[PDB]
Amino acid sequence: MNSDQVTLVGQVFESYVSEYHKNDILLILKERDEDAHYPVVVNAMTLFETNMEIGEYFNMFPSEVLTIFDSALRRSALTILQSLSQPEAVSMKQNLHARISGLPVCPELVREHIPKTKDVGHFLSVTGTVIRTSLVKVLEFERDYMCNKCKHVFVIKADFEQYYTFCRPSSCPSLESCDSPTRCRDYQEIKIQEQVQRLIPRSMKVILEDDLVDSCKSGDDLTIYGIVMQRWKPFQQDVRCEVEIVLKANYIQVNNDEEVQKEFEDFWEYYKSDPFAGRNVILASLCPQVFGMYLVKLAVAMVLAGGIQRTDATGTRVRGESHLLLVGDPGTGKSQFLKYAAKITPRSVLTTGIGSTSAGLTVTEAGALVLADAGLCCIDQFNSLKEHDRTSIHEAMEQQTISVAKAGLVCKLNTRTTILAATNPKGQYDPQESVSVNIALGSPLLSRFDLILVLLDTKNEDWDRIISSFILENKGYPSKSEKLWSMEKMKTYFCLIRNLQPTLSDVGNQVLLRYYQMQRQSDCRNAARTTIRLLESLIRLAEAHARLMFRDTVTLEDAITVVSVMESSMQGGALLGGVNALHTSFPENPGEQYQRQCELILEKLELQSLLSEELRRLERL
């Protein structure tokens, strides 16, 4: 390169670092130790837009720029030390480094796939996970060997391209014709596997150096801004030489459009007079290959909504998710719902159940529950799930954490997953002889499931004809209106409402408390659904219903909806009556039904002081 170019580049970086990076260098100067290591973080877009010439000089030879910036940082530190007013609690350090970040979003610099052979000497950005990890080891850099046959000492260095080997020199750079270890560094070796979510992918062997050692973990998402170079091997006569692709790291990250919003507020601002029309439209687009079955489709959305985790200070943490289980005669559509819900959720694992061994349901290696962190694992054929395995999940289903010390290793892992289940009612189902009798599951397990919906096929002469016409005429989506919704829109909708944190209110909790106190003993209090875990779920479902309607303040409507749904969930013994889930259709007008439901609920449980306020609010809208 030209002599003036590097000088101008160094001037640019030193000016930028002196203008925008005084606090960090001041902090770095005021530290103990003399010569260990100290990095500096510098953004790229700002200095790229400050001068147009630096970018062209940078993104063609990404080797000299780092050294020039290191020299600029050194001279800046020297200048600051010279112009210092408190030279007592300060120390001068000879080891500085550079770390650039904030690369543009150009398609050819944010490539997700590993380059084949075309990117050598190009600055790239890759993302992926971690598989293997080596040990901390120390290299030798430079020797300063004894001077032979001459006087001036030699400062020969090592070469990276030859696996850190040393070549014996014989031609001295001496002016005349006469021609004849307290240094340490750091090292590591890591393997990166490309993610499958955004895609079998191959592996990238990344090499770390200096401070980057002991800064990565197995099983985390990484983003490295490194250079791509080639590593050779010693040559053998009359064979095929071997090469490899590596990635020298220069920076690391531990990371783990207004149009979509504007569309969402347009949608939930148009539906202002009628708030339940939006909810009806949301529920209709779920699994639109099935006719009817309002309650189950609402329950699936409520379960998939989620909740918030609330951990106490010292040791304890409570559950913040929900679980669902369905029972019914074969041929009702249980598998369709699981298949459809296995796709909307970003991360989901589909398993057979009885065909899955103990290596998946628990830890062995990662199984199924641990592998589905922050996701949803679907469970099928729960009738005979290998009773040992069927009972060895009580710990991880309620405490969200496994605690195993098999073979004297003492390993602890985290698992937070919503479980969906569907099993056949072995034996001819009866209206009486509650689920604990027909399916014969233990009471401790038949308490952690929030909603248990029962499906029964009975004698009717209308639903059969409607479903026969639906199947035969091939009338996909009988509502020919072009509202629908695409699957990507639903995925974005359910991936965006997970960020809101609703807060409880006073017109709310009183209703749930009175309902729980009333239900704790009416005349039979069932046998297993009247424990303390009932109220712990009545809040998690009422809160989840509030995150599907774009708000963060629970009101009377959410409480009424959740109470009605959960009361309908409890088959047989109840306080209003049981309604079959399958024989339910979308109401033509939801406002009148909501008003009737509120008037029916708020009379026998004495909260009449709220009914007047609610009717006044409903009238004035």
Partner 1 sequence: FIPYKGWKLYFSEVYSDSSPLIEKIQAFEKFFTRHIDLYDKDEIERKGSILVDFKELTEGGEVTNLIPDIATELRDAPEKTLACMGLAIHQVLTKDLERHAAELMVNVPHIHARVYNYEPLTQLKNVRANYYGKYIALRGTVVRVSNIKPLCTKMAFLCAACGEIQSFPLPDGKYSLPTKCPVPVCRGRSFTALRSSPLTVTMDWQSIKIQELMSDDQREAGRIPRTIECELVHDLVDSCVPGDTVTITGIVKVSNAEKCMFLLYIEANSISNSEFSLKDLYAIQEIQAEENLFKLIVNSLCPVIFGHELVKAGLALALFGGSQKYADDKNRIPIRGDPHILVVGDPGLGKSQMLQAACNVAPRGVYVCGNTTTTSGLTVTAGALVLGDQGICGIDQFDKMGNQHQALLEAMEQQSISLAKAGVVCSLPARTSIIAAANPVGGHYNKAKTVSENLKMGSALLSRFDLVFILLDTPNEHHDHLLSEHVIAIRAKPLSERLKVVPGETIDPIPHQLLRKYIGYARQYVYPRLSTEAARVLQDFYLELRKQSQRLNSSPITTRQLESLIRLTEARARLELREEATKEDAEDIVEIMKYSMLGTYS
User: Is the CB of 315 or the CB of 330 nearer to partner 1?
Assistant: 330
Cβ at position 65, least distance to partner 1 in Å? 19
320 labelled ligand-binding:
no
Cα-based distances in Å from 118 to 190, 233, 362:
23, 20, 44
Options 230, 335, 391, 593; binder of Mg ion; rule CB under 5 A = 335
Applying CB under 6 A, among 335, 468, 531, 595 the residue interacting with ligand ADP is: 335
Q: Residue 243: name its binding partner from partner 1, ligand ADP, Mg ion, none (Cβ under 5 to 8 Å by kind).
A: partner 1
Q: For residues 329 and 580, give the distance between their C-alpha atoms in angstroms, rounded to a whole number.
A: 13
Q: Min. distance of Cβ 447 from ligand ADP in angstroms?
A: 25
d(Cα 489, Cα 527) in Å, to the nearest integer? 43
Rounded Cα gap, residues 121 and 118, in angstroms: 9
Q: Give the range of 94-102, 144-152, 326-334, 427-435 binding ligand ADP by CB under 6 A.
A: 326-334
**Beta partners for 249?**
226
> What's the per-residue H, E or C state across 357-401?
CHHHHCCCCCCCCHHHCCEEEEEECCCCCCHHHHHCCHHHHHCCE
Say if CB 469 and CB 463 are below 8 A apart: no
Q: Is 331 annotated as a binding residue?
A: yes
Q: Nearest distance from residue 474's CB to partner 1, in Å?
A: 7
Binding residues for ligand ADP, total number by CB under 6 A: 12
Query: What is the footprint of ligand ADP within residues 422-481 (CB under 6 A)?
Result: 467, 470-471
Report angle CA 73, 74, 78 to the nearest 5 degrees: 115
Give least dist CB 433 to partner 1, A.
18
274-308 residues labelled b (16+ CB within 10 A) or e (exposed): ebbebbbebbbbbbeebebbbbbbbbbbbbbbbbe
Closer Cβ to ligand ADP, 225 or 382, answer by number: 382
Residue with Cβ nearer partner 1 (414 or 469): 469
Number of residues engaging Mg ion in binding (CB under 5 A)? 1
- Is 107 annotated as a binding-site member? no
Contact by Cβ (8 Å): 598, 560: yes
Q: Which does 384 bind (CB under 5 to 8 A by kind): ligand ADP, Mg ion, partner 1, none?
A: partner 1
Asked if 330 interacts with ligand ADP (CB under 6 A), we say yes
Give the chain's length. Answer: 621
Residues that bind partner 1 (CB under 8 A): 116-117, 161, 202, 230, 232, 235-245, 288-289, 329-331, 335-336, 339-340, 343, 349-352, 354-357, 359-360, 364-368, 371, 380-381, 384, 424, 457, 459, 461, 464-465, 467-469, 471-474, 476-477, 486-487
Which of the stretches 233-241, 271-279, 330-338, 409-417 binds ligand ADP when contact is defined by CB under 6 A? 330-338
Q: Contact between 336 and Mg ion (CB under 5 A)?
A: no
Helix extents (H) in 274-330: 275-284, 294-305
Strand residues in 9-122 grouped as ranges (E): 39-43, 97-101
Query: Which of partner 1, Mg ion, ligand ADP, none binds 290 (CB below 5-8 Å, type-dependent)?
Result: ligand ADP
Between CA 362 and CA 354 the distance in angstroms is 14
| Sign, Cα dihedral of 391, 373, 310, 527 | negative
Binding of residue 87 to ligand ADP (CB under 6 A): no
Read out DSSP for 77-106? HHHHHHT-S--SS----S--EEEEE-----
* Residue 117 interacting entry, from Mg ion, partner 1, ligand ADP, none, C-beta within 5 to 8 Å by type: partner 1
Is 329 known as a binding-site position? yes
Tell me the residue ranges of DSSP E strands in 210-331: 222-231, 244-249, 324-328
Q: 584 among the known binding-site residues?
A: no
Distance CA 8, CA 52 (A): 13
Point out the annotated binding site for ATP.
328-335
* Residues binding ligand ADP (CB under 6 A): 290-291, 330-336, 467, 470-471
Point out the annotated binding site.
328-335
* Residues binding Mg ion (CB under 5 A): 335
